[PDB]
Enzyme design. Structure first.
Site, PDB file in Angstrom:
ATOM      1  N   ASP A  90      -4.934   4.844   7.494  1.00 55.46           N
ATOM      2  CA  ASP A  90      -5.192   3.396   7.516  1.00 55.46           C
ATOM      3  C   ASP A  90      -6.548   3.004   6.917  1.00 55.46           C
ATOM      4  O   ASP A  90      -7.292   2.204   7.493  1.00 55.46           O
ATOM      5  CB  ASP A  90      -5.006   2.826   8.933  1.00 55.46           C
ATOM      6  N   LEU A 135       2.843  10.191   3.100  1.00 61.33           N
ATOM      7  CA  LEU A 135       3.760  10.026   4.225  1.00 61.33           C
ATOM      8  C   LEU A 135       3.431  10.982   5.369  1.00 61.33           C
ATOM      9  O   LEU A 135       3.294  12.190   5.161  1.00 61.33           O
ATOM     10  CB  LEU A 135       5.210  10.222   3.770  1.00 61.33           C
ATOM     11  N   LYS A 168      -9.107   4.611  15.357  1.00 63.66           N
ATOM     12  CA  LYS A 168      -8.462   4.705  16.668  1.00 63.66           C
ATOM     13  C   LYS A 168      -7.381   5.786  16.686  1.00 63.66           C
ATOM     14  O   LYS A 168      -7.002   6.313  15.638  1.00 63.66           O
ATOM     15  CB  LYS A 168      -7.898   3.344  17.105  1.00 63.66           C
ATOM     16  N   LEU A 184       0.845  -1.187   0.000  1.00 64.79           N
ATOM     17  CA  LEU A 184       0.000   0.000   0.000  1.00 64.79           C
ATOM     18  C   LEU A 184       0.884   1.241   0.000  1.00 64.79           C
ATOM     19  O   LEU A 184       1.775   1.377   0.844  1.00 64.79           O
ATOM     20  CB  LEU A 184      -0.922   0.025   1.223  1.00 64.79           C
ATOM     21  N   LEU A 197      -6.083  -0.528   5.292  1.00 61.87           N
ATOM     22  CA  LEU A 197      -5.973  -1.508   6.374  1.00 61.87           C
ATOM     23  C   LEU A 197      -7.311  -1.778   7.061  1.00 61.87           C
ATOM     24  O   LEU A 197      -7.457  -2.774   7.775  1.00 61.87           O
ATOM     25  CB  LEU A 197      -4.946  -1.042   7.412  1.00 61.87           C
TER      26      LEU A 197
HETATM   27 BR   LIG Z   1      -3.497   2.561   3.901  1.00 60.86          BR
END
Ligand SMILES: [Br-]
Length: 271
Positions: A159, A94, A142, A90, A162
């Site tokens: 994320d 940054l 979170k 992925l 994810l």
């Molecule tokens: Br990601």
């Protein structure tokens, strides 16, 4: 300087580690088209099912076009192989300044004026994702995935790739700090209100400077308290009566009794 490439060669992998997980390793990257550094994150593919593997092939395309001030930019995703380990890379924007979790450990107590500012920005991004067509549900929001752009700057939600690997219906090992979860997550029946519950817990951690349900030892102990309607011990430690009132309305046991994102943005605390 590099130890990898993006097949099309738009970005390359370096040997500089930033983050680590049970399935993830975060390394530095660099866009060749825009000359900007990115986050190169490898995800061990062997651990991933076929049902979740085809999701990544479809979800990534939708995440590419998303642009929002409070959302970590998604660039590309592909299956990769290093030596004899199969993985999925992925590539995202940054984030060097870190997360809210590192900020809460670095500065302990967080100021009221910056808490109001950041939580609004989290809701701005959460509204954005829910107002997408079709709506995007974060599922796994979170403090350690809400990234700061600077020590003074705005927050971004990360994320996103994810998020589909939350694996709520899955049984995981009892190791480290147990993660809290919404009551309706354990049953795989959820919607927008699951992010509101996640936000309420995030604001709680921002206000009390501690992780919710810390008195518990394992995730099963948390489950018993969450599903029955027993609130965490840290909830009573909220000094501000207004902030506590907002949290209370977000962490409701029933998903129909919780506040909407629209209600929270129109609330008196967020102006
Ligand atoms: Br990601």
């Amino acid at each position: 300087k590099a130890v990898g490439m993006s097949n099309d060669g738009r970005f390359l992998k370096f040997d500089i580690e930033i983050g680590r997980g049970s399935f993830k390793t975060v390394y530095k990257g660099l866009d060749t088209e825009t000359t900007v550094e990115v986050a190169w994150c490898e995800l061990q593919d062997r651990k991933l099912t076929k049902s979740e593997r085809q999701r990544f092939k479809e979800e990534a395309e939708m995440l590419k076009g998303l642009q929002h001030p409070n959302i970590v930019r998604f660039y590309d995703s592909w299956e990769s192989t290093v030596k004899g380990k199969k993985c999925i890379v992925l590539v995202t924007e940054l984030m060097t300044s870190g997360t809210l979790k590192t900020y809460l450990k670095r500065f302990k107590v967080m100021k009221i004026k910056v808490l109001r500012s950041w939580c609004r920005q989290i809701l701005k991004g959460l509204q954005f994702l829910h107002t997408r067509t079709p709506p995007i549900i974060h599922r796994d929001l979170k403090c350690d995935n809400i990234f700061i752009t600077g020590p003074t700057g705005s927050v971004k939600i990360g994320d996103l790739g994810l998020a589909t690997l939350k694996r709520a219906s899955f049984a995981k090992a009892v190791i480290g700090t147990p993660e809290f979860m919404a009551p309706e997550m354990y049953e795989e029946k959820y919607d927008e209100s699951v992010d509101v519950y996640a936000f309420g817990m995030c604001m709680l951690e921002m206000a009390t400077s501690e992780y919710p349900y810390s008195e518990c030892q394992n995730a099963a102990q948390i489950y018993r308290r969450v599903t029955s309607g027993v609130k965490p011990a840290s909830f009573d430690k909220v000094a501000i009566p207004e902030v506590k009132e907002i949290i209370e309305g977000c962490i409701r046991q029933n998903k129909d009794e919780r506040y909407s994102i629209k209600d929270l943005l129109n609330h008196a605390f967020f102006q």
